Amino acid sequence: VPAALKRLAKYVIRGFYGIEHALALDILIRNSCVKEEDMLELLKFDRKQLRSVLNNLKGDKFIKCRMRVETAADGKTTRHNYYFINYRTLVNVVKYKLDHMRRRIETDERDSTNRASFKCPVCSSTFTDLEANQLFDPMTGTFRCTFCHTEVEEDESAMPKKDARTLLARFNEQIEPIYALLRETED
């Protein structure tokens, strides 16, 4: 297990997940496979507390679990859950998770591009510049709302575009350390 894999996993886990996920992952990093009961006693977490965290790790498939069945010394059946980290799925899921942001970020940019500009101040309804001309009243010579028979505003549509764009831009700037770690771990 190259250290680059461990660094990437630790960076993404501490970057976008809580310390509970990071601590659990560090256990799976320190030891390739650890039993759920061992992780439970070590982390001192409750069953549902750890299970939900593990379910999250199961959700992103960053870790794999295998079930072992054996008979205890007293004759009772025992079913132990052995968890281990799957760097292949982890790197694949983060690559999707990150390239999905790019799709979502560009979707948000396309939204900032498509967010209708005109709007009615009475009913707080937003109208598209294509619909605004449909809603234009020649008698008044200005845009109005059919339901409210009131003036339609247009200038307030810049504020949400500007604000959201700052978040979108700052997201791309901060994500670069993980992208560098990915380029270092593509092999």
């Binding site: 960076y11 976008f16 601590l23 560090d26 982390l43 959700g59 899921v93 790019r102 901060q174």
Partner: protein
């Protein structure tokens, strides 16, 4: 009361006796006098002497006497930091905040002094678990980005789609 009451008073008196600052080791007979249990059975005396006073994790035999293990108890910032560090290094896990506050009165002074070096995990019962903050690999993001991450679904995909998205866009 004869069986458990006497031994319980031994523990309760000895535990409280330490809170007085008398860290010097004590004998069972001295505690029996202070607890007024001089009439405890001969077999009970030796039983407490040979088992109860040695098997407890907080009592240590020193020159034939019993002590509160001042080194084991957490009563300072350095002990708290080192214990969390060593526990994290060995993968032992966290320690409950109540274990430190009960060991060190007003542990908040030590906790606030370490600050971000202590990671606090809140249990469903509001109890806090303390963990060492190993600063080897760190990364943090804005709430908007943490919210964006939560918004992107990952579990509702098959291995085909998980890999297809990569080649679909070009990686």
């Amino acid at each position: 009361g004869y069986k458990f009451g006497v031994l319980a008073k031994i523990v309760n008196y000895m535990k409280t006796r330490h809170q007085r600052g008398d860290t010097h080791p004590l004998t069972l007979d001295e505690i029996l006098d202070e607890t007024q249990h001089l009439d405890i059975g001969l077999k009970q005396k030796q039983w407490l002497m040979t088992e109860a006073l040695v098997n407890n994790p907080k009592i240590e035999v020193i020159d034939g006497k019993y002590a509160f293990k001042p080194k084991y108890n957490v009563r300072d910032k350095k002990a708290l930091l080192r214990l969390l560090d060593q526990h994290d290094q060995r993968g032992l896990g966290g320690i409950l905040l109540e274990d430190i506050e009960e060991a060190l009165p007003n542990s908040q002074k030590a906790v606030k002094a370490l600050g971000d070096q202590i990671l606090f995990v809140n249990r469903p019962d509001k109890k806090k678990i303390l963990f060492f903050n190993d600063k080897s690999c760190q990364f943090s993001v804005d709430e908007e980005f943490q919210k964006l991450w939560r918004s992107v679904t990952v579990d509702s995909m098959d291995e085909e789609k998980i890999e297809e998205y990569l080649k679909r866009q070009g990686i």
